[PDB]
Design a protein around this ligand. Structure first.
Ligand SMILES: O=C(NO)c1cc2c(Cl)cccc2s1
Ligand SMILES: O=C(NO)c1cc2c(Cl)cccc2s1
Ligand SMILES: O=C(NO)c1cc2c(Cl)cccc2s1
Ligand SMILES: O=C(NO)c1cc2c(Cl)cccc2s1
Ligand SMILES: O=C(NO)c1cc2c(Cl)cccc2s1
Ligand SMILES: O=C(NO)c1cc2c(Cl)cccc2s1
Ligand SMILES: O=C(NO)c1cc2c(Cl)cccc2s1
Ligand SMILES: O=C(NO)c1cc2c(Cl)cccc2s1
Ligand SMILES: [K+]
Ligand SMILES: [K+]
Ligand SMILES: [K+]
Ligand SMILES: [K+]
Ligand SMILES: [K+]
Ligand SMILES: [K+]
Ligand SMILES: [K+]
Ligand SMILES: [K+]
Ligand SMILES: [Zn+2]
Ligand SMILES: [Zn+2]
Ligand SMILES: [Zn+2]
Ligand SMILES: [Zn+2]
Lengths: 408, 397, 399, 408
């Protein structure tokens, strides 16, 4: 069963932020317009029996002082002293992450959605669950960052990993380094994090690059993987870059769950304009390539949104991801019309009104990164007494003539 | 409120240089040890949405080829020896000798820029009345040249952002060395008045900010008379230094009426700086620095305070800690009581031998310059059609 | 209206190269000798408001560093020999061997750009239905490389301006003896510009492309897949066989693509009397000239069309052909019958047209079936990929 | 007496073109606003006693067929063209850069009327200097419109001057562009020496006035056409240093009976061309420096307009030029307020409302051009049997220590 997080209130809340406007509505209604919704099991967002149980859920990662401040920030904007200002600043509730009347509700909602998704996986109601309202990988224990206020991903992972030798693989496909999730599990071997991203001087947030690579500490050493890529990269190269690494991670780690953040700001048409990925499906979408690969493992999977600042193109991508998940899991062909279907956001898909993003692909190796990452994987396996099947990893990279990159 | 620039990454990068080592960490930890952090609005350093946007920000002052060179210099020091052609490229930008490469030289340099641009932004959006960046203040760097361990000129870029938001900016450079990079950048610009007080003497870095019968150059084009300089002989103490620049600061404020003040507060004027040229102190009963900062903060113009030179790291920290307390006092009107003894913290042992907050120190030409500076100011004011109570300006002397 | 690009300075620049000498002057003077010029609208070469706007126009295709190198090369040839470092620099852009520098290499190259951009503009604003630029058509030049006497690709820049007006689609038809590789490569990834080159190809023959590469034909990539068309032909082909080879392809490209504009490179090196001595086409207008057959066919479509020159190293015979192409264009567009005397009229260059002084050039005059099925399948694939409606047997009927 | 060309109908006509809008009105109204008009002798535009006399005057330079065409073009826009009228217009470049419009012939004629009347005031010695800010259309050819020039008022004016009664005219073209139309008209004539300083670079209009060696006239006109092409970016001082000694040398050797100066304002830093960086500053403006120099010769002088596409800044410069001419010719101090005076075009000088243009000035030498130019001047002097005063020219260049550039 493929689940998808949705609700009337959930939709209203996910659409109440100044930065992301009605993006979530575009996504879900495009998915709706393509008649995908009947194929999916609706996963209702989690609700609690009291403020204290809510508080307990959220402070499983975030500090009590941080959650209180975020509460007050909401309350304040719903009606600031010199000390109110300093309190909010001490949590970076400013600049990139300012208050607005529904800031706490907005932020809580993504947590409700992703915790519910996690719960649906744990009780085996869904093989895969999608939450396009979640995926806020930058929030820290006591700090808002990059439009992220509560880290729904950390909390969903914490629920999975503490369910019941249970390991979680986190795969971050967003343009940006998933610093908040990596940091939360820096000392934990059982959550292996892997972020592919752009990194360069001055580029947000600054981590996931050379320092050598830091890769976890204590019992968490070797458990935080990173692949920084240069700008301009297309679907095929991005696919080749991360494909073998994902399979090798799956072979060695043998995750009980996978969590995938699928931020769409790698699209060629994103306002960032750094990567040149597409949503094309025949020249194949780097995104769809990765998602299909992850789904072929038959490991219970949570698929989350994230970045993506071209709202219609983000909808175009995530609708195809959704159709693909249905195909890969239900074994059911999802034929998607090249023309955007009639619905109330139809006008936002102009001037072409077509499903493919309006981009024309056209045209540096990272083999040392592969070699480095495989050695880290070797070290992770040794530290945690896992089997490092050199045979299967070799044979994998050998499919491209790069078996030599694999350490014994 | 009073803002101050810091962050975890920011701290690591500011401490990544060979020359200034862990100085920034001593300063911030001492500020933290004295409990000043809760009084202050943390200002996060600027980050950008793409490499093009970063280049756009930095090449507002610096040439693109220089920035390319600086970035290549980093990559080279992260893999190596340079070839003859690379050495030649680096030399043509003075990325050599006093300004060598090191593994994180571009990231390190850019950090100061990130810090002081956010500081400027916080002032512009009026989130803070004053912002402190003890990681910034690199006043020697030129359009296409590293100089005086400055690789990128965070001050020029901060000031540019301020004038680009009719805005006039007053730049006050208290460092022991002439603030030539900033002065050169606005040589043709009357909207940014620069004023540096400094030591100058034959062969002393960087050589400018003094007689050039020779005369003082002071700006060109519409920027004529807009660059002010007061060179001072070695040995000057707090009182004489204060009296030297006091009436000038006050007259500049009266006539210019700046929308923003940017202060470079390099601590190499301290009697205990290894330069051993001036004899300023951090004393607060009076410190030249504390006197100047308070005079400037009395104007209640939104103000950026930056670091700079300072090669005795604990004494620099002792100085900038007092400056930070003073700012908290003059802006918020709230009494700050700093213990005379250094509090226990990570770096307590660096504060030997006595572990006091005061530094371990016991303590006509100026009139000529005053008359000259006063005629230049009148000239500037004339040329720019400004209102000047000359009946007032003169009595400051 | 039929436009033609000319001007006194333009003429001087187009005649400043050591390779093509005064060919352009011969062409325009023959056209003038035959009283065609009063029938045509003068299209003046484009000029720019500043160095920056010129650079912006040219670097819409070419890299800045290449344009810089080309301008440096001109200045270096204007003074007294190059240094070792300059030599290296020039070599990295192939500003050597076939494409050396000379005192006005950048102005000369730029002139053809100025003319073909002015031509494109005359079409877009609909001042002219067809525009001729016999100073243009330099199809071998690449983004950062000179090739085959081509320094700046005027055709690519003209086409870019055409598609950048206002789904505008452009059909490029390259009739030169040589494969139009620079144009094809520029639009390799664009479905909006369909390129089609008929040419000689054989081992060792310049530039080497436009043919089998069991090999098979490359034909575009990305969303540009199947959008590059090529028909390579064996040496010795005559007017009639060439016409029949190209005729059905041209007609079906127009049917399927329905272009908004047609850009035609009319390189005259396929002439029997070109010193290449490869193809045996004529300028005959009763067999009938392959060139005139193709142009009449393209003109019959009533699409705003850009006609450019290109190769052609027998200068009087290039003049003879393009004089006839020009007259045909005037006839086909204005409906006005043009009567050209079979003998060369007196004019300043009359001596060059010996020994017989006639307008006709002095000449006594399966594989393509597989190429046709191949090309038809590519066209089917292009239409499929691009959601184009067309028949199936109506397309097939033309064969 | 300093004359200035103006009238009510003249103003309306000069303001009737699509390209130059109401520029002429801004100029004249700013001059009026600074109270300069009472200092100036109004020179009324020339009118004729019959169409045949008008036609005779204009066809002293232009072909009958071009003027016929230009007349027809006006008639047409005062009523679609037939295919052949179109071909007729195209043959005269009455298109693109020089389209027809309702008053195109009246507009073009007006400038001729202004510059001919101006030449006549100089000839009969009514004025020692005459200004025509409606004239200076230096691009127009015998049978061809060019660079929005339709009729060449300058050629017609010069012709009137040079026919009055050893009489030589110096033509000085300060426009950003090469004065090709004037140069070409007098290419074979020694009694009109032309000098143009301008930008020239690949693709820049009109293309001439640069290396071809320099062409410099033919037949009896050999060596009589001078050109100084300059690279982009030049300031007041360098431009001043570039043409000052050449101008003084031209005056010494040629001994003009009249000077005609085209003072096109598109060398201003604030011109949308953005190529040179001249100002109108006056305590120094290149323009003011050149005009002051030319006036110091005490030779009867015609001052004309031309290019200039920042209309307020063109008015700002020509107003200053106008005051300077009054000052220099009458000996009468012309104090001009730094604030723009109240007048109906006051709002066009925002946001500063001051007379100085809104600009902050902030190996590349041409000494070989001086040497080349002085050599040409020597060649001219010999061809025409004139005194080449070596010593005076030497002493002139020796002021700047460059006497060695002067040939014997
Ligand atoms: O998408 C993002 N993270 O996953 C972010 C975007 C931005 C922007 Cl556009 C500005 C500043 C910070 C961030 S984080
Ligand atoms: O066995 C299955 N369907 O009949 C599948 C299970 C899964 C899981 Cl658990 C994850 C991803 C894809 C599939 S298909
Ligand atoms: O702190 C400084 N400038 O503000 C500088 C110190 C030095 C030294 Cl110690 C040697 C060489 C250059 C500089 S710049
Ligand atoms: O108004 C104030 N406190 O109540 C102050 C404002 C400022 C400014 Cl804008 C700059 C520097 C000091 C102060 S105190
Ligand atoms: O006409 C041509 N291309 O369209 C060319 C002729 C030649 C020759 Cl003759 C030698 C080398 C390259 C080329 S390209
Ligand atoms: O519509 C027309 N005449 O009335 C014509 C248009 C064209 C075009 Cl667009 C190209 C070639 C010939 C003609 S005739
Ligand atoms: O001012 C001019 N000549 O003296 C000219 C300007 C232009 C422009 Cl902006 C375009 C095309 C021709 C000309 S001539
Ligand atoms: O003599 C004069 N004023 O008293 C002057 C005559 C001239 C002439 Cl003819 C031309 C330019 C300036 C002056 S000043
Ligand atoms: K990522
Ligand atoms: K981990
Ligand atoms: K200083
Ligand atoms: K200044
Ligand atoms: K061809
Ligand atoms: K194509
Ligand atoms: K000129
Ligand atoms: K002449
Ligand atoms: Zn992102
Ligand atoms: Zn210093
Ligand atoms: Zn050819
Ligand atoms: Zn001009």
């Amino acid at each position: 069963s493929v689940g998808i997080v949705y609700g009337d209130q959930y939709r209203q809340l996910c659409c109440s932020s100044p930065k992301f406007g009605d993006r979530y509505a575009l996504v879900m209604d495009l998915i709706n317009a393509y008649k995908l919704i009947p194929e999916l099991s609706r996963v209702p967002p989690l609700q609690w029996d009291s403020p204290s149980r809510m508080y307990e859920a959220v402070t499983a990662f975030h500090s009590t002082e941080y959650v209180d401040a975020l509460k007050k920030l909401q309350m304040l904007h719903c009606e600031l002293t010199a000390d109110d200002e300093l309190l909010m600043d001490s949590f970076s509730l400013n600049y990139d992450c300012p208050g607005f009347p529904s800031v706490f509700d907005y932020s809580l909602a993504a947590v409700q959605g992703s915790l519910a998704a996690a719960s649906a996986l744990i009780c085996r109601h869904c093989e895969v669950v999608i939450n396009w309202g979640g995926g806020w990988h930058h929030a820290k224990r006591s700090e808002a960052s990059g439009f992220c206020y509560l880290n729904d991903i950390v909390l969903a992972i914490h629920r999975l990993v503490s369910s019941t030798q249970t390991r979680v693989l986190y795969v971050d496909l967003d343009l940006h380094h998933g610093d908040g999730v990596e940091e939360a599990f820096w000392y934990s071997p059982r959550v292996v994090t892997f972020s592919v991203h752009h990194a360069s001087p001055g580029f947000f947030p600054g981590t996931g690059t050379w320092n050598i690579f830091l890769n976890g500490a204590g019992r968490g050493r070797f458990s935080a993987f990173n692949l920084p890529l240069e700008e301009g990269i297309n679907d095929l190269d991005w696919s080749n870059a991360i494909g073998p690494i994902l399979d090798s991670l799956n072979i060695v780690i043998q995750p009980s769950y996978v969590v995938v953040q699928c931020g769409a700001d790698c699209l060629a048409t994103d306002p960032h304009r750094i990567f040149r990925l597409t949503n094309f499906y025949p020249s194949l979408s780097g995104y769809l390539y990765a998602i299909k690969k992850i789904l072929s493992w038959k490991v219970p999977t949570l698929i989350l949104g994230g970045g993506g600042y071209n709202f219609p193109d983000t909808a175009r991508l995530w609708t195809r991801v959704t159709a693909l998940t249905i195909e890969e899991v239900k074994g059911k062909k999802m034929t998607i019309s090249p023309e955007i279907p009639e619905h109330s956001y139809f006008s936002r898909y102009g001037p072409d009104f077509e499903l493919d993003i309006d981009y024309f692909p056209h045209e540096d190796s990272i083999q040392k990164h592969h070699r480095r990452i495989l050695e880290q994987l070797r070290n992770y396996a040794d530290l945690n007494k896992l089997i490092y099947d050199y045979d299967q990893v070799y044979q994998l990279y050998n499919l491209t003539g790069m078996g030599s990159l694999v350490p014994r």
